[PDB]
Amino acid sequence: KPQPIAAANWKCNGSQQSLSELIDLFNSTSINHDVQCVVAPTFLHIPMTKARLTNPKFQIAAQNAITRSGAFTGEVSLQILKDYGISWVVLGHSERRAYYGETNEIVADKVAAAVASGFHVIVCVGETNEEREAGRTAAVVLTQLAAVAQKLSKEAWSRVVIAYEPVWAATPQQAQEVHELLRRWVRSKLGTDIAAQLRILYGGSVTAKNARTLYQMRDINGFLVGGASLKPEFVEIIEATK
Amino acid sequence: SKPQPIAAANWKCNGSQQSLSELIDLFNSTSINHDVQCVVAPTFLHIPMTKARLTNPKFQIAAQNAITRSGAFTGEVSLQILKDYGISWVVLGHSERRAYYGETNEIVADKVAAAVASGFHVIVCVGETNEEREAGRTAAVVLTQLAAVAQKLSKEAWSRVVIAYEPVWAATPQQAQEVHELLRRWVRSKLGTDIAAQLRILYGGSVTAKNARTLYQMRDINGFLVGGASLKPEFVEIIEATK
């Protein structure tokens, strides 16, 4: 397996006090194995997190971006993130696909720009319950992945990370099967080396209680964690990637 | 007669730490000796540095957008997160968000109601496109935008409401005044003499040091929501035009 990633998606949550307490815990947590930890605060909380986080095994990510600075009231661009020394970004999260009109095309454009600008990107994919029940999981997630892949160069794949979100929800067996589906497509289109090096993270419900059983699956390379990542239990989730 | 004017700077999706720190230094050194509320709206990422450095007593800091509630909304910032950070102004319904980011009248209205409820001053943006104006639908469009917001508010909320008119279709000062007057008269009919007289309606078209005074001169214009010029020293002259 490639180097695992334990990523904390704080989503639209946090106060200065609560996040300070949580970051202090992360700072006192000794990460001793080969794992890349990532924390993704809201834009407003990035400066405070950057100033307070000292743990050398952690990188800070944005939860979204648009490609270029300009007349886009309310948005934050990759240019602005880079100026602030942020080099990781989560794109295509199921909530943005749902609420904020992010189509396969929009996601692909964002991903292409980010990796070309040297960002590591966590690209989110996943199918609905209606799509899963119809037997269309592979058709849907590979269409999502194909849209993103069409832009990317060989070298760009070193900075791509995929996160599978079972929007339909999951067992580790079910998760592992979709991760196999994704990796198979990549192997077929981009070759054995890129497929072997690619991190595919599980982005469903992850807790201290289920993280080890998930990480043990052959094609799961870590997690994009929701609610648990605002809690001290995130420590146990990082430990599950040994 | 006119209520306190507002000069608001919408920085949009722009700025580096360096460029904004120079801008903030300039604003800090600018002496302003008349009653005016200045507002600067940085990107979310730049709000912390602006809060820590901005000192000019005439200025407040605003967000360029927000969502109603905290939770599972990856990529967004909520009103409560802004309030915890000590931000008390917000721009909502900007034309770029209505056009690019799916903000309907109802979505804007829900956000505005939530912001007022949580103690924010809100600059609520309305405005019609070229297609709409050419069709003779200016009034219908802006009053529909306005009425949708008003429906979710009651008279008490209005002390914290500011309207900004964006002539997206582009304007002469007379063209601006025509819309501002139509807006204020609608408010007067629905909320009464006092609310309508005290309401700030800002012009949010192209404002420059050159044209600002002529605009401020119109009866129903109470200041500006400024785009590109707000990233420049020219903004200083625009503030002066509200004197």
Numbering used by the authors:
A (entry chain A): 4 to 172, 179 to 251
B (entry chain B): 3 to 172, 179 to 251
Text lifted from the article:
We therefore designed a chimera of TcTIM with regions 1 and 4 of TbTIM (TcTIM 2,3, 5–8). This chimera and WT TbTIM exhibited almost identical inactivation profiles at low and high concentrations of MMTS. Taken together, the data with chimeras TcTIM 1 and TcTIM 2,3, 5–8 it may be concluded that, at most, the 13 different amino acids in region 1 of the two WT enzymes account for their different susceptibilities to MMTS at concentrations higher than 50 µM. In order to check for the absence of major conformational differences due to the sequence perturbations on the chimeras, we solved the crystal structure at 1.65 Å resolution of chimera TcTIM 2,3, 5–8. The analysis of the structure shows that the chimera can be superposed on the crystal structures of TcTIM and TbTIM with a RMSD of 0.385 and 0.437 Å respectively, with a minor displacement on the loop of region 1. A displacement in region 6 is also observed, which corresponds to the amino acids of the flexible loop involved in enzyme catalysis. Thus, it can be suggested that the disparities in susceptibility to thiol reactive agents between the different proteins produced by changes in regions 1 and 4 are due to the effect of their side chains and not to any major rearrangement of the main chain. When the pKa of the thiol group for Cys 14/15 of the wild type enzymes and the chimerical enzyme TcTIM 2,3, 5–8 were determined anew, under the same conditions, the values turned out to be 9.27, 10.53 and 10.61 for TcTIM, TbTIM and TcTIM 2,3, 5–8, respectively. Altogether, the data show that the relevant residues of regions 1 and 4 modulate the reactivity of the interface Cys through long-range interactions and that the interface residues do not play a role in the susceptibility to MMTS.
Take for example the glycolytic enzyme triosephosphate isomerase (TIM) from two evolutionarily related pathogenic parasites, Trypanosoma brucei and T. cruzi. Many of the proteins of these parasites have a high degree of sequence identity; in the case of the two trypanosomal TIMs it is 73.9%, with a sequence similarity of 92.4%. Both enzymes are homodimers whose three dimensional structures superpose with an RMS of 0.96 Å and both have an identical catalytic site in each monomer formed by residues K13, H95 and E167 (based on the numbering for the sequence of TIM from T. brucei (TbTIM)). Of particular relevance to this work is their remarkably different susceptibility to sulfhydryl reagents like methylmethane thiosulfonate (MMTS): the enzyme from T. cruzi is 70 times more sensitive than the enzyme from T. brucei. The initial site of action of the thiol reagent in both enzymes is their only interface cysteine (Cys), which is at position 14 or 15 of TbTIM and TIM from T. cruzi (TcTIM), respectively; it is surrounded by residues of loop 3 of the other subunit.
